[PDB]
């Protein structure tokens, strides 16, 4: 029962810059969406909201 819940799961903030990747629905498209990156010895994800941009416009 350990689908490596990458969306939440430890805080973990530092290096307000770092190179940090947009979010990413790691489960749905949205709702709870974590970016990943680096900073400078570390690296990780963080959630983020997400707009359930799916489509960026349905139309």
Not at 27 to 46: H, L, M, W, Y
Request: aromatic letters at 8%.
């Amino acid at each position: 029962k350990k689908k490596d819940k990458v969306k939440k799961g430890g805080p973990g903030s530092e290096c307000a810059e770092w190179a940090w990747g947009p979010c990413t629905p790691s489960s749905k498209d949205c709702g709870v969406g974590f970016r990943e990156g680096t900073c400078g010895a570390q690296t990780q994800r963080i959630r983020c909201r997400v707009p359930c941009n799916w489509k960026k416009e349905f139309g």
